Amino acid sequence: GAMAPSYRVKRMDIAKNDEECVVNAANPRGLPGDGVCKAVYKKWPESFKNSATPVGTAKTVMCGTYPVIHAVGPNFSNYTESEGDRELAAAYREVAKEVTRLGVNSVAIPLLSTGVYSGGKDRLTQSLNHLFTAMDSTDADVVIYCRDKEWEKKISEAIQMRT
Ligand SMILES: [Cl-]
Numbered sequence: 001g002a003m004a005p006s007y008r009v010k011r012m013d014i015a016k017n018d019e020e021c022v023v024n025a026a027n028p029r030g031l032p033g034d035g036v037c038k039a040v041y042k043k044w045p046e047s048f049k050n051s052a053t054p055v056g057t058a059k060t061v062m063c064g065t066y067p068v069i070h071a072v073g074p075n076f077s078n079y080t081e082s083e084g085d086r087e088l089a090a091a092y093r094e095v096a097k098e099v100t101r102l103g104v105n106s107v108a109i110p111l112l113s114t115g116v117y118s119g120g121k122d123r124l125t126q127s128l129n130h131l132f133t134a135m136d137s138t139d140a141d142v143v144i145y146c147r148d149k150e151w152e153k154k155i156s157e158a159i160q161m162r163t
Contacts, residue, residue, distance in 0.1 A: 001139030002105050007132075009155040014132075014145035015043035017108030021060075023095055025117070026070035029057055036110045036145075042069050055079075056090035058098045069098045070150045073112030076119025088113045088127065092134035099140050106141040111155075124151060127159055 007111075014022060022044070025036040030051035032041040041134075047068035049113055053059035058071045071094065090106040091112050100106050102153060111127040135142050146152050 002141040005139045005141060006118040007135075007144065009144040009146065009152055009159060011126055011146055013039055013147075014038040014110055017143065017145065019106035019131060019141070019143055020104040021067040021069060021099070021102060021107050021151075023058075023069045023071050023107060023109040023112075024051075025061075025112055025114075026053070026071050026072050028052060029088045033064060035115050035122050040048050040068060056087035058091065058094035058144045060098050060102065067098075068105070069095055069102075069107070071095050072114055073117050074103070074122065075117040076113060076123070077117075079119075083115065084119075084128075085126065088123075089130045089133065092130045096134040096138050097132070099135070099138055104140055106143065108110040108143050109135075110145050111151075124154055125158070128155060 017083050024040040027033045030048050044063035047063040051061050055072050058069050060069045061069050069071055071089045071091045074084040076084045113127055114123050127136040143156055
């Protein structure tokens, strides 16, 4: 585990992360996909061998020795708010289990079920809180990756509030 387990947020490409493993915002089919998923495919294509896994689950595939945790959030275009919220909480719990199993000291993570899977809604607070509920019991340094300046400020604030 990390010496003083922390949360941080960085506004850059998660494919350039400085952590011991990465969470992919995967699709259920293990396809190259778009957004974070496409950057992950371009950086760690080997990790997409038998990566396909259902909604609300996480499946780790090693690129060399570097773990890629394919976390499948619900697409809110397809799910009801109620069922989406449940599968989004589940995907984060499976990430916590895989990060623990791997014994890594740090993990790079995007906010699941945002952008292409948000159903056109701002789910920053929803997704971030399910991230906290899962990862709070873990001892890994968590680094959250986003691309939009207003998202970084809001994520930074939510982290610092609890400190
Ligand atoms: Cl970048």
